[model samples]
Target chain A: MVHRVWVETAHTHGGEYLKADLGYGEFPELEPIAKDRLHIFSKPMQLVTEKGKENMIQRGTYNYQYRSNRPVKDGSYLVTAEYQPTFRSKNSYCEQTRMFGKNIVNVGHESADTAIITKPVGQNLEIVPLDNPANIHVGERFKVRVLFRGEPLPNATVTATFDGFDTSDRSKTHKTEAQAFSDTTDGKGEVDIIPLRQGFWKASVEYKADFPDQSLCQKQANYTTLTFQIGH
Target chain B: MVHRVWVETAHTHGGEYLKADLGYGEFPELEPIAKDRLHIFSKPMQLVTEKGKENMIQRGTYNYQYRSNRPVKDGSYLVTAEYQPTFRSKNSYCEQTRMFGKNIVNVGHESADTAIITKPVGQNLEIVPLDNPANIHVGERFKVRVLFRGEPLPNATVTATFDGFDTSDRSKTHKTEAQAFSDTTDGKGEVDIIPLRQGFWKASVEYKADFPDQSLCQKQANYTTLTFQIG
Candidate 1:
């Protein structure tokens, strides 16, 4: 008898969670299953924070476990878990909640659940601007690197639209920013672009990679934007 | 032997991922493993979303397998994979690399290499704002619910604050929004709160469960705010 365990967590706050901070006290509960699907398991609880003031919030770990008094068979199965943020503040006693789930659940028909689960990609996109060196003359070679997962994503094509001294979207007209360079990815997954002009220009990049399907990979694909500024 | 195998799918257009209106191809590869750890098996490709005319996304499925050269014993193990996303357009092609290890990463001894790896909660947290009703005379009754994982969490204390009419955090203030009728969860995990003197009050709830450790049986909670006008 194999157990199909599904765990879920919900935060009482309003925040889009792409990852669970397991080292933080933030963890979800494991769902109960029938005798055919029970297995010995333990989940770790985390503090859910990157940087901390040390004194402001309490620190500890919360672990969840599930054990069945019976045995289970093995094959392919779907196992899932949920997390809910029920954090509370003493002053206003405000509670915020956030929830996340896998795209699909898989369970092995035998005694094990040999399914792969992936993390969800974000839908919100962002763009930024880059400033060139001190006082390079116009047409000076300025290099801009495009990064993915924080590192350079090779083979990415980049384009720039320059704004006139006083207007935005100047690139929309014939008055473009600088000559744009589109460098492909080397073995390191990064791209470099060069600018050609001397006005305010906004640059954007469209990154690419092979994504896993949620049905099998059990993760969500995140497609967003990246932007930057260039000046002479 | 417990072999941890994983297969990934890639689209022909590498600039950006396959949009809701575009089609894509698949790629199969072996997952990386460490000493003593078996290969994390690769399940089928889950076509979780289907393309729509206006970008309407839903869930779909696919089939895949692990063709091992040799056979071994049978037991239970952790089989994991991930959905890696690329940030692409005409100008740039990047991947949120740090996020790669955030999902299930064939959890083995090699730590630090992986960032935050673990599945997030599977539920929707919606906020219901209070104090929006257009009409109100004097006295009216209103009710709001707090839920966790689809089921109602009981004994959970719920309260709300009303900043309506006047914008002062001080007096005329109704601090605790405890259940008006009865604030408590039955054996099935459910709780409700009623409001009186309906002007514009916000409500919230906090619940504590019998978690085995400080970790397991973790706490679950939810809250909503709404406006009620009494005539």
Candidate 2:
């Protein structure tokens, strides 16, 4: 079971975030299966001030637990967390399968164009927002689109949870996941979520298919998540 | 002539502001009249995250070009820029007087409570925002209260300008001040201004009176400005 989380913080200069973590509240930094493929990007949005409108910035690394060194500025960022292909015994269907997953979420502190948060970043499996999380409220209907290889991933399974949803010090799954909203994407590869609390929310989508080469593995899976804050 | 400006930037960190400036656009780091009295402060706000709320932190100096040795965290701050007392001939009343000025602005890069932006910091002649500048918008009325020794200084003179209002590479003042809103404070030391653009705006207030003891200077003056980003 792989649960990835990104913790944004300010320690010295405002908007400086900590390293990408593995657990929600308590855990070690995420472990990369092989040569890690982690990337952090910052894109200047409309009316994004103080600096010129440069294309965008990309900082990449092999360590899954990547910490930004260029100290952030006022811009919208897409933090893509990569979990390279790995074989899972007890977690996959038929007791084994090759699983490839990634978490690409939108993170920022200042005012910028809200459109970038929901666009796909061309991952094997990625979840994107249909509307800006900043504009969605606890009682409102929040929608998301599931994309697999840049195509609609209809029938994919998705589950969601929040920070305080589970009180366990550390665990693979949260207590809320037992009864949380776990459903399949509609025909359009879209899911409607009505957030119950005013805090950070995460939605993970998993899609499985038969392995192209049955001699290697019985099944193959693509997993992704969309994480954002709901400040009302 | 003291027109203090704070340029919030992100050359490094997202919320890291540049050096406090004298002229808005084209000018060197502010020159200290004597020992500078600059101070940067940070106070935790409600709903603030990734850090615990602690008592406010202060970094002080006299260079007038103070940069925090310690990196910032997630908290609301009151950045206080100080100008020690100096004698100005062409700028002061009767062509000679002792003038002291300071610029105190609220700056932060994350979500936090919006209350601390208006409270006074007890400067001799400080201008406190009656309302949070973040809530203000172009074409909307913004109000401020001027305090003298923690008391209302009614009938004081206040002037305002934005960064782009002046195109001159370097000048003592902006073009807006010629016809910009320059007026006297109301009975309660309150001034109302309607911002005309969606950018940074500065408001300066000056209070003058007879020197308590003319042996040192003919007249005395206190000047302060409230600088904050509009967008």
Candidate 3:
């Protein structure tokens, strides 16, 4: 059987829910999977950091929902969902696990909001915030960290680009020039950038890995992207 | 059973035929009607006038077809077909006849052709070529006559227009501003015009008539358009 996963935000009479689904076909509203067949790697919550004095800017929010399950304010939040699937051979002996994680920016607030790295789990590939009062502001310099497997993935490539619209291609397939600012991670997997003209921005990292002899899947490549909104 | 009439030209495989259909629909390919129910009205022939020297430009052609069913050379010809439908009631006393006549242009030859009036039965609307050299050329002048019931249809409206491409909208329903040059027929049912450009031109006359008090049909309107390719 083939598996697919997607993240969607829906507003209903009950309130707004940032949800994810796993099934077949494009945009499938799927049936519940047996407990043994499904796993939740992370739940939603907000990530915050302290600046100097009394005022603080939210660097990033991981999994926070409003009282009504809606997004309370508009800015960029680091929202994540991971799917870990396990399969066994017919003899029930050979088993393997494929982990798929998505790190996305959930824009809950607009103007004065910036894309910042708040909490660094260090396990998955992540963009962590390094600037004090890390709110995405146009013409402001900000630093980010790329963590792979709970550690700084040194020398990784990072790019922060913006398109002047709220529209996401969903497929998130094509990236064009005139919208990119490219940089490489430092020895500590960190990169610095100044926010370009604000709109919607996607900061992405490209990484590759080789599996161990005991691993079931070998030679892995990933395109991890984080999306957030920025103010001019 | 309703009857329809039209004007058609049959070229021998290769030659071109300029034709038109008139009936309920804009242009219907009608089935053959009984001879008694049809009238010749006109046949295909050429219309030409005297020129100074050996060369003569044709004014028009009426009721003529190519020999051996082949369009051998380029020239203008008059072609005609009419329908006369009559009906009788069960009472055997009420009878009615509707006469519909259409005069059209059938260009048999393309290169170096002209339009002239050959046989003016003096009936219906006719585009009579006035200049001895009635070739359709840019800057050249031409005249036409509109006749009704064998008499000059004075004060009739005539329009000369051309479409850039050799294409018809088929609706032929709407006359646009940029495509028409309008004029009125004189006391002799004639109008003069200069060929504006070198292209296919349609010189048409519009007429309206009410059936005689004793007739069965209420009224009739005719928009007779003559199409010719000019150079």
DockQ of 3: 0.01
How many times do residue backbones clash in model 2?
Answer: 5
Evaluated with TM-score, which candidate comes out highest?
Answer: 2
Candidate 3: what's its TM-score on chain B? 0.53
Q: Which stretches of candidate 2 lie over 4 Å from their true place?
A: A1-19, A22-64, A88-112, A168-176, B1-231
TM-score of each: 0.19, 0.37, 0.31
Please provide, for model 3 over B7-41, each residue's C-alpha lDDT reduced to its tens digit, 9 standing for 90 to 100: 33333222533333332212222343344432532
- Residue A114, candidate 1: alpha-carbon lDDT: 19
In model 3 chain B, the worst 10-residue window by lDDT is B49-58
Query: Which candidate model has the greater TM-score, 2 or 3?
Result: 2
| Highest-scoring model, lDDT | 2
Off by over 4 Å in 3: A1-232, B1-76, B83-116, B131-134, B163-179, B213-218
Q: Report clash pairs, candidate 2.
A: A12-B71, A12-B72, A13-B72, A72-B14, B36-B62
lDDT of 2 by residue, B10-42 (tens): 222325532343332222233443423332111
